[PDB]
Amino acid sequence: GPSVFLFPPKPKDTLMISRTPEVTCVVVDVSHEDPEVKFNWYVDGVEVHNAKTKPREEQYNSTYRVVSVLTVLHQDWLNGKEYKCKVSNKALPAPIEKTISKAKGQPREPQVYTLPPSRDELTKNQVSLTCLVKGFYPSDIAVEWESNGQPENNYKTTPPVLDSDGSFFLYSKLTVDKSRWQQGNVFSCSVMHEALHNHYTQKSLSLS
């Protein structure tokens, strides 16, 4: 038979009121031979009726991928409500439920430190600007870079890693032309997380 995977909203979406946070139910391996899929959604137990049940894509294995989507209240998600996605594709002897909720526990504020390039990287053409983000809980977080209020794109951020004290840390690495590190521009790492004031903080970095 077909299987089911349930997904949390993107971290940035729950933290900024402008954005629309969603839980996503993904039904995989649904066959032509019995292709109709049903969904039912529950918050904290109660059936609600906000979900859209968007259709419906091909595949290599010629099986299907049926995806349903539910919008969620920012504060609900952050207060720990659990979301139940229920899938009925008879071909299923009984319908599948899956449940998801935010990680439990006292949210902890990230500490953010920008670290300049090593001396030895300076004999290169591009240099690495590093943002260390640590001491945060839960692991939901977003990190971005900018300069002169314009986004930097050439950066990569590690996944959150569980640290020895049970909090998380990560690093983000921005690569810039050494031209710019010397020509003196200011660069900033922005962090969004629920335990920050206004869910956001920014730390700057430039040549001292």
Ligand X SMILES: *[C@@H]1O[C@H](CO[C@@H]2O[C@@H](C)[C@@H](O)[C@@H](O)[C@@H]2O)[C@@H](O[C@@H]2O[C@H](CO)[C@@H](O[C@@H]3O[C@H](CO[C@H]4O[C@H](CO)[C@@H](O)[C@H](O)[C@@H]4O[C@@H]4O[C@H](CO)[C@@H](O)[C@H](O)[C@H]4NC(C)=O)[C@@H](O)[C@H](O[C@H]4O[C@H](CO)[C@@H](O)[C@H](O)[C@@H]4O[C@@H]4O[C@H](CO)[C@@H](O)[C@H](O)[C@H]4NC(C)=O)[C@@H]3O)[C@H](O)[C@H]2NC(C)=O)[C@H](O)[C@H]1NC(C)=O
Which of residues 115 and 162 has its CB atom nearest to ligand X in the complex? 162
Residue 177 lies near its own copies (rule: CB under 8 A): no
The span from the CA of 127 to the CA of 129, in Å, is 7
Nearest distance in Å: CB 89, ligand X: 15
Please give the helix or strand (H or E) that residue 75 lies within, else none.
Answer: helix 74-78
Task: Provide CB contacts within 8 A for 83, sequence distance 6+.
Answer: 6, 23, 41, 42, 43, 70, 72, 99, 100, 101
Residue 139 lies near ligand X (rule: CB under 6 A): no
Q: 73: how many CB neighbours lie within 10 A of its CB? A: 13
Which region, left, alpha or beta, applies to residue 121 given φ > 0 means left and ψ of -120 to 50 means alpha?
Answer: alpha
The span from the CA of 72 to the CA of 95, in Å, is 23
Q: Which of its own copies, ligand X, none interacts with 34 (beta carbon under 5 to 8 A by kind)? A: none
Pairing of strands 150-151, 142-147: antiparallel
Residue 34 lies near its own copies (rule: CB under 8 A): no
Which of residues 142 and 176 has its CB atom nearest to ligand X in the complex? 142
Q: Which of its own copies, ligand X, none interacts with 63 (beta carbon under 5 to 8 A by kind)? A: ligand X
Which of residues 3 and 50 has its CB atom nearest to its own copies in the complex? 3
Q: Cis peptide before 108, with omega less than 30 degrees from 0?
A: no
- Identified binder of ligand X from the candidate list 12, 16, 24, 180, rule CB under 6 A: 24
Residue 47 lies near its own copies (rule: CB under 8 A): no
Look at the chain and count its residues: 208
Residue 188 lies near its own copies (rule: CB under 8 A): no
Residue 152 lies near its own copies (rule: CB under 8 A): no
Which of residues 101 and 128 has its CB atom nearest to its own copies in the complex? 128
3-state secondary structure of 11: helix
Residue 26 lies near ligand X (rule: CB under 6 A): yes
**Binding positions for ligand X, 40-59, rule CB under 6 A:** 59
List of residues contacting ligand X (CB under 6 A)? 3, 5, 7, 24, 26, 28-29, 59-61, 63, 65
